[PDB]
Amino acid sequence: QEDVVVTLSHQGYVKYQPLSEYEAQRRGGKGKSAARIKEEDFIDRLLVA
DNA sequence: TGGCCTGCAACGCGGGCATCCCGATGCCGCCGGAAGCGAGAAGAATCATAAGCCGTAG
DNA sequence: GTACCTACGGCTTATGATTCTTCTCGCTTCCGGCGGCATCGGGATGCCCGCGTTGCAGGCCA
């Protein structure tokens, strides 16, 4: 099974990681220190299968 | 340990109100294209019909 | 001295036939596509003040 989530970035990077690790990394608030970068990358598409 | 949310205070701009100009649009009439799947034809998966050898018997 | 046939049963290997599935054509008609006009709801601008926005400092969070 290996329940994972597939996240596609805006620059075209595709990858997946298990749902447990994804929920563990999701814990906490996103720091605006990285948001000050106008050339960063963000998630474009998300799906769980 | 570094950074983020929020309270307090000061500043500014747009929401609301109306209307004049404006842009879509519903309707009417004339013209275009695609769908319509039904049917013909081809390719492929599956089913049907022979042997080869395993070892004692003739 | 020196080889040559099938019967009893199970799994494969080689080849043709059959039906399922899919590729491709059929013109036509109906649903739609498109041009034009009166209409009706909408956007922007004039104006004000009060709420939205923002600077600064404090306490809390990852």
Curated annotation (Swiss-Prot):
Source organism, top-level taxon: Bacteria
GyrA-box, short sequence motif: residues: 25-31
Localization annotation: Cytoplasm
Disulfide-bond pairs as recorded: none
Additional information: When the enzyme transiently cleaves DNA a phosphotyrosine bond is formed between GyrA and DNA. In the presence of quinolones this intermediate can be trapped and is used as an indicator of drug toxicity. The enzyme-DNA intermediate is also the target of a number of topoisomerase poisons, including toxin CcdB. Few gyrases are as efficient as E.coli at forming negative supercoils. Not all organisms have 2 type II topoisomerases; in organisms with a single type II topoisomerase this enzyme also has to decatenate newly replicated chromosomes.
Subunit note: Heterotetramer, composed of two GyrA and two GyrB chains. In the heterotetramer, GyrA contains the active site tyrosine that forms a transient covalent intermediate with the DNA, while GyrB binds cofactors and catalyzes ATP hydrolysis. Can form a 2:2 complex with toxin CcdB in which GyrA is inactive; rejuvenation of GyrA(2)CcdB(2) is effected by CcdA.
UniProt domain comment: An N-terminal fragment (residues 1-523) can be reconstituted with GyrB, but the complex no longer has negative supercoiling or ATP-independent DNA relaxation activities, although it is capable of DNA cleavage; ATP-dependent relaxation is inhibited by novobiocin and non-hydrolyzable ATP analogs. The fragment has ATP-dependent DNA relaxation and 30-fold improved decatenation activities, unlike holoenzyme it preferentially binds supercoiled DNA. The C-terminal domain (CTD, approximately residues 535-841) contains 6 tandemly repeated subdomains known as blades, each of which is composed of a 4-stranded antiparallel beta-sheet. The blades form a circular-shaped beta-pinwheel fold arranged in a spiral around a screw axis, to which DNA probably binds, inducing strong positive superhelicity (about 0.8 links/protein).
Physiological role: A type II topoisomerase that negatively supercoils closed circular double-stranded (ds) DNA in an ATP-dependent manner to maintain chromosomes in an underwound state. This makes better substrates for topoisomerase IV (ParC and ParE) which is the main enzyme that unlinks newly replicated chromosomes in E.coli. Gyrase catalyzes the interconversion of other topological isomers of dsDNA rings, including catenanes. Relaxes negatively supercoiled DNA in an ATP-independent manner.
Family: Belongs to the type II topoisomerase GyrA/ParC subunit family.
Protein name: DNA gyrase subunit A
Source organism of this protein record: Escherichia coli (strain K12)
